[PDB]
Amino acid sequence: APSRKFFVGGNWKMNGRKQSLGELIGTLNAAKVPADTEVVCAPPTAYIDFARQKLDPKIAVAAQNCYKVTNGAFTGEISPGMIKDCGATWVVLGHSERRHVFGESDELIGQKVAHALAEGLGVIACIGEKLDEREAGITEKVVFEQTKVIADNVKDWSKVVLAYEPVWAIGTGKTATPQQAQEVHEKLRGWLKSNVSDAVAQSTRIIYGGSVTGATCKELASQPDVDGFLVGGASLKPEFVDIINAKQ
Amino acid sequence: APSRKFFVGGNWKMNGRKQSLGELIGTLNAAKVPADTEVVCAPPTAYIDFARQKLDPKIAVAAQNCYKVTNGAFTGEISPGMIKDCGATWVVLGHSERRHVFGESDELIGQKVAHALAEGLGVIACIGEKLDEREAGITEKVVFEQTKVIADNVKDWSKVVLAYEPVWAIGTGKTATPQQAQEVHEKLRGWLKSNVSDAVAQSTRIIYGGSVTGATCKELASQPDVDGFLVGGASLKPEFVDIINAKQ
Amino acid sequence: APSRKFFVGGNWKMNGRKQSLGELIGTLNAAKVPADTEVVCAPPTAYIDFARQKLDPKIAVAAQNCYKVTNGAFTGEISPGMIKDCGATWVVLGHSERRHVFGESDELIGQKVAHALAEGLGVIACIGEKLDEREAGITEKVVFEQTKVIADNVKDWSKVVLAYEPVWAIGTGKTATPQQAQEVHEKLRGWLKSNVSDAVAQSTRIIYGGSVTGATCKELASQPDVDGFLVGGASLKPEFVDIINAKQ
Amino acid sequence: APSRKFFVGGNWKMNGRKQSLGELIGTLNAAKVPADTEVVCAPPTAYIDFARQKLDPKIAVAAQNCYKVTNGAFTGEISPGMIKDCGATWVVLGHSERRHVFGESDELIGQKVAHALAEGLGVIACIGEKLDEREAGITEKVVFEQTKVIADNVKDWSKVVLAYEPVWAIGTGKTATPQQAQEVHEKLRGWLKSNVSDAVAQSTRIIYGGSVTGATCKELASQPDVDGFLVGGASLKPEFVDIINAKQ
């Protein structure tokens, strides 16, 4: 009985300013999210406070990243305590952009996860295999190694959700279908049940982090092992509300 | 403008929280800012907005980093636009930790600088050699190589400040001999004069990003080619209001 | 220079004598060196001079190792100066046997590289993981860890070549699957791009130091991220004049 | 009746280039060595051939090291056959720098000795206790264990000479006198006579490998059990000739 509460995150990435963002917050603030869905918004780092202040207490705020120490000589970086200090209760970790564009390693990612969590912050842990990894059929290998690192650094799965990112269908000329989406979420839940525990795997939300719009959210949402989304571009528009109601 | 207005930058790095930073902000706001000086506080990204809202108008706020595009799929990053949108007028680029801990290349930094200036932001470009390089005498080459890449992306030095940081010795009160800081800064000024213009070099601030305590800040500024500092730890201590007044 | 001139290195190791090496040298001297390629022969230290004197100017000579100081009480060692003084322009550092049989640490190798480059010599820095490491998936980490240490000592990649060697499988004709060689070399090129510069990665030769016969040298170079080899045994066989022409 | 022919080796270590070395060879080539003294020069590995070619047939050439196999996958290493192939008739083995700076073990040293010898090459076998070993009074213990390994790998003492190295007086703040030099050579000859044979001990030359200059060579040479030297620094200068005439 997968009573997993639908999870819908909105990764604005590096987009928006007070104006467009405040305007965005206005739409969701005036929107009516299903009492059965959990909605989170990940604003640009400079607008985490702005967003949380303007954001309706019903919606949680999430950082798009953080470091592995409470304080230190790390110009440009922020710690989970600040993220908490700003009212944000979540942190996106391991986003494909952070791993690839910025080269963040699993080791460092594993350390931010353990720290973020120790700091009492929720954690949206992102995984996903690149195009070549997909072309080889190493999807399982790749995604299990990343999840494992996340699991070894997670002593409590209540504060975490998994987001699978089909980086292989991101600007590559390959398209990811909802079936192959489920296929992956399946193995990931299978990895948990087997490597963690039956309960954890049954409660842990595994959200889809691939191309999601109000037009395709219904299909993807109907998938058994897909209990949520981590929306990118669409999280900047009114359509985000439609995605908030995909499971419905 | 021949008279290079003193420039005291305070790099808070990844330290403090609203409460803490609030106590610090409230202080500087009670600190008289001599027209003979130009003070700037670089708060962690999450607190750029907060500080700018609480901080005194006479004091400028500066992001500790930014990306090289107005908007994009760059989770965890912020654009010059955003910083500016938050009331900050400056940006720190090339910092010791950014390139030596997060591997930011000169290339990337040159692109950030070009974009930051192009966005209406002022930037504090950082440079400095390492211990292996210092103990090689290639300190001038490495710093010039770094300054060249930055200068290649600067078309107007009106809103630009150079920051030399002796990476091979920064943090504790073990302030590297003021003579060593003068030698480098002197060559940098001789670089801008020939590679740009006598006026540019005679109007460009070459602040010291090394060990600067609320006391040692005297003999340091005492040097002819040292128009300020990029205070690290002390920038957090109330002794930051002193380093600002490193004279009389 | 975008077009990365093919680089075929021949590592003779500890084999041959004047007679033998003379027969080999006389051959390559009759072998036309395509401008599309850059061939180098690394003779045993005792025969560096001999080979350089007999070898064709179009072919470069390379020591198989050197020390990290111009001169000193280091019986049994040679300095970059000496190698250069013998007409050799390159040096092999970090080779599988040097660190895995004679326990040379990355540190030592990083110092040799820094000194070699500083002495006017070109260097072929070698890297590669072991079987225990390969069978751990930490191949990328180990090779990056090795490349980092080397890059930390390189200030000009104009006279530098990377050499990946699959230690867990080198020697016989059991050439490790060309895909495995491509995966690693591909990541290394993505490393230099971000850790150094797109230009550097798009101008840096990443030769394969694994199993390269006078035949298999086709499908190997066929891979996009394989700009040459570091021929082991075959470098002694007349089939070395073929591996040089691993195309058409 | 110790009719042991005076032996004087010159360990140039890692010093010189064609120019200074050729200049050095010029002095000895033009020098007149006593028909009763045996002179050997150990050039940097890269100059063994150079030296032998420029060296007067009266003086022998010696490698400063070698490996334990005729040929093989040992980049940077050379075999006794090459050393022979270059006209060198000697090999320095076990030099303190090789044992300490490079960690060569007695086992490996014992194997190079047996191989070098099997290859028909003379062998300057080096021994000597470190500072701490000397401080403890383990001189005998230490030096007997090393000599033993050399003896077990020597089935013919005609092709070998022993060089005692007071490593304990090498850059340590301790100075070695000619008396304590003899003291050690005494025991070493006592070790031979007792563990090898009376004849071997009476014919085997045991040369001093400590600080030796034309100013102190006379004193050391007059010692009964000191029948030669293994000169370091002084072997690079004209003074080497004076040492060649110390016994006189």
Swiss-Prot record, chains A, B, C, D:
SUPFAM superfamilies: Triosephosphate isomerase (TIM)
Compartment list: Cytoplasm
One BP annotation, GO: canonical glycolysis
Pfam family, one: TIM
Biochemical pathway: Carbohydrate degradation; glycolysis; D-glyceraldehyde 3-phosphate from glycerone phosphate: step 1/1; Carbohydrate biosynthesis; gluconeogenesis
Record cross-link Glycyl lysine isopeptide (Lys-Gly) (interchain with G-Cter in SUMO1), residues: K141
EC number of this enzyme: 5.3.1.1, 4.2.3.3
MF GO annotations: methylglyoxal synthase activity; protein homodimerization activity; triose-phosphate isomerase activity; ubiquitin protein ligase binding
GO CC aspect terms: cytosol; extracellular exosome; extracellular space; nucleus
Modified residues annotated as Phosphothreonine in this record: T172, T213
Residues binding substrate, per UniProt: N11, K13
Alphabetically ordered keywords of this record: Acetylation, Cytoplasm, Disease variant, Gluconeogenesis, Glycolysis, Hereditary hemolytic anemia, Isomerase, Isopeptide bond, Lyase, Methylation, Nitration, Phosphoprotein, Ubl conjugation
Residues with 3'-nitrotyrosine modification: Y67, Y208
Modified residues (N6-succinyllysine): K148, K155, K193
Reactions it catalyzes: D-glyceraldehyde 3-phosphate = dihydroxyacetone phosphate; dihydroxyacetone phosphate = methylglyoxal + phosphate
Active-site residue numbers: H95, E165
Matching PROSITE patterns: TIM_1 (PS00171), TIM_2 (PS51440)
Modified residues (N6-acetyllysine): K13, K155, K193, K237
HAMAP family noted in UniProt: TIM_B
Disease per record: Triosephosphate isomerase deficiency: An autosomal recessive multisystem disorder characterized by congenital hemolytic anemia, progressive neuromuscular dysfunction, susceptibility to bacterial infection, and cardiomyopathy.
PANTHER family, A to Z: TRIOSEPHOSPHATE ISOMERASE
Oligomer status and interactors: Homodimer.
Designated name of the protein: Triosephosphate isomerase
